[PDB]
Ligand binder design. Structure first.
Ligand code: DKL
Length: 133
C-alpha cells in the first residue's frame, strides 16, 4: 500500500516554503538557509514499520512509525508534537498536533514525482521530489 513512496527522493521544486516556515514561527536566519537547501528524503519499510529520514547540509531528521498509530515527534524546527501517518486516497498523510495547533504534510505521487503539500494556518507549500536510482 505504501510501496510506491519507498526510496530516496531529492528536492527539485519548492513553492511557498518560506510562508509555511514563517507561519510555524521559524526565525528569519533559519528560513534563509532552508530556502537554499535541497533535502534528500529516504522512506523505507521493515514490516509494518516505516522510517522517514530527511537529510541536508542544514538539518537532519528521522522518524519511525506504524501507519495509523500515534507517535511522539520532535520536528526540524524543535516542535514537540503528537503525530500520526496514514494512507488516505493513496496519499501518505502526516498530521502533527501541538498546543492545540495542527499541520499536515501530505505526500502524493503524480507522474512518478513525489509532491509534498505542507499546510499550517493559511500557508500552503508545495515541494516536489524526484526519485534517485
Ligand atoms: C519545518 C518542518 C519540516 C519541513 C519539511 C520539509 C521537507 O521538504 O521535508
Amino acid at each position: 500500500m505504501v510501496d510506491a513512496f519507498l526510496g530516496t527522493w531529492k528536492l527539485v521544486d519548492s513553492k511557498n516554503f518560506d510562508d509555511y516556515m514563517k507561519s510555524l514561527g521559524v526565525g528569519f536566519a533559519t528560513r534563509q538557509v532552508a530556502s537554499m537547501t535541497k533535502p534528500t528524503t529516504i522512506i523505507e519499510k521493515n514490516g509494518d514499520i516505516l522510517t522517514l529520514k530527511t537529510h541536508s547540509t542544514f538539518k537532519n531528521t528521522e522518524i519511525s512509525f506504524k501507519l495509523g498509530v500515534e507517535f511522539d515527534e520532535t520536528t526540524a524546527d524543535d516542535r514537540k508534537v503528537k503525530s500520526i501517518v496514514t494512507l488516505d486516497g493513496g496519499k501518505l498523510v502526516h498530521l502533527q498536533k501541538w498546543d492545540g495547533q495542527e499541520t499536515t504534510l501530505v505526500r502524493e505521487l503524480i507522474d512518478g514525482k513525489l509532491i509534498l503539500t505542507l499546510t499550517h494556518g493559511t500557508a500552503v507549500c508545495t515541494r516536489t521530489y524526484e526519485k534517485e536510482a
